[PDB]
Amino acid sequence: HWGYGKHNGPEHWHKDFPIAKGERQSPVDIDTHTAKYDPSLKPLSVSYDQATSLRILNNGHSFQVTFDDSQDKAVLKGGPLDGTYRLLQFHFHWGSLDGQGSEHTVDKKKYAAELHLVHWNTKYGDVGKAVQQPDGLAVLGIFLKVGSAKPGLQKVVDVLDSIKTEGKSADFTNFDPRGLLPESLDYWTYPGSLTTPPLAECVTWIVLKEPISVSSEQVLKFRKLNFNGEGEPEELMVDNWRPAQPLKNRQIKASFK
């Protein structure tokens, strides 16, 4: 069973998931000087006004907030995407200390955390089918730096004590993910993969340039979560990030000059 430790972490994943060594793996370092501005890229359309959050869950690798994706309520369109992508869930990756935690890096800089909003292409009908397609998923990635608090994150922070260990969930209705977005929707994009098993090469990555700021107290609460189930030896859920993978034959494109 895979994880982030010495004996089951990212450098082991290829044994159960050989696509780990594939041609379009994520995350990557974003070399800002090499990314080409693409004037044909559209602004991203984030339509989250009718989002319906359902539950918050500790899945043993991260925590996730899940949405009703049975209709087009919270959708991502435009940008590099063709078609409509439904929001299924968001989750985070973070570090043991503020100098690591993000999956993507920017000129090798690591952020304290990274938010992933996972969306699937409605033309494939369900997420299981979408992960089998090269354009099945769109993941919007947002960097977190530590400074001022993010008010729209606090409702999430405050319930994490109720989902400390793997398998715990709670109701998490009426959460508005618009409160997690930075001012600018300027972005980089590239074709990649899921960053956790099964590492499927089904993702159009959209990584926002502008980080959000969160407070030290907010990120400290992430670090109190446990990878373990209740009753097992306590192992803090920290450093749940995959390192940058080889870019290979890919171009990262920027929406902005």
Active-site annotation, residues? 61
Residue 34, annotated as binding a ligand = no
CA nearest 193: which of 124, 153, 141, 123? 141
Q: Which residue is nearest to Zn ion (CB)?
A: 116
Stretch that binds Zn ion, among 64-72, 79-87, 114-122, 247-255 (CB under 5 A): 114-122
Q: HSE on the CB side for 195, CA within 13 Å?
A: 30
Residue 36: strand pairing partners: 253
Residue 116, annotated as binding a ligand = yes
Stretch that binds Zn ion, among 75-83, 113-121, 154-162, 198-206 (CB under 5 A): 113-121
DSSP class per residue in 100-158: ---SSEETTBPPSEEEEEEEEEGGGSSHHHHTTSTTSEEEEEEEEEESS--GGGHHHHT
Q: For residue 73, what are its two tokens?
A: 């309520």
Considering the complex, state which of residue 3 and residue 34 has its C-beta at the smaller distance from Zn ion: 3
Residue 91, annotated as binding a ligand = yes
CB of 257 to Zn ion, least distance (A): 28
Burial call 46-65: b when 16+ CB within 10 Å, e when fewer: bbbeebbbbebbbebbbbbb
Answer whether 116's CB lies under 8 Å from 140's CB: yes
How far is residue 234's CA from residue 35's CA, in Å, rounded to a whole number? 42
How far is residue 181's CA from residue 164's CA, in Å, rounded to a whole number? 25
How far is residue 36's CA from residue 39's CA, in Å, rounded to a whole number? 9
CB of 91 to Zn ion, least distance (A): 6
Residue 236: strand pairing partners: 226
For residue 198, say if its preceding peptide bond is cis, omega within 30 degrees of 0.
Answer: yes
Binding mask 185-204 for Zn ion (x = CB under 5 A): --------------------
Residue 196, annotated as binding a ligand = yes
CB of 240 to Zn ion, least distance (A): 9
CB of 28 to Zn ion, least distance (A): 14
Considering the complex, state which of residue 24 and residue 116 has its C-beta at the smaller distance from Zn ion: 116
Stretch that binds Zn ion, among 1-9, 46-54, 111-119, 243-251 (CB under 5 A): 111-119
CB of 233 to Zn ion, least distance (A): 25
- The count of residues interacting with Zn ion (CB under 5 A) is 1
Stretch that binds Zn ion, among 112-120, 125-133, 176-184, 201-209 (CB under 5 A): 112-120
Q: Answer yes or no whether residue 116 interacts with Zn ion by CB under 5 A.
A: yes
Contacting positions for Zn ion (CB under 5 A): 116
Q: Which residues are annotated as a binding site for Zn(2+)?
A: 91, 93, 116
| Residues flagged as binding site for substrate | 195-196
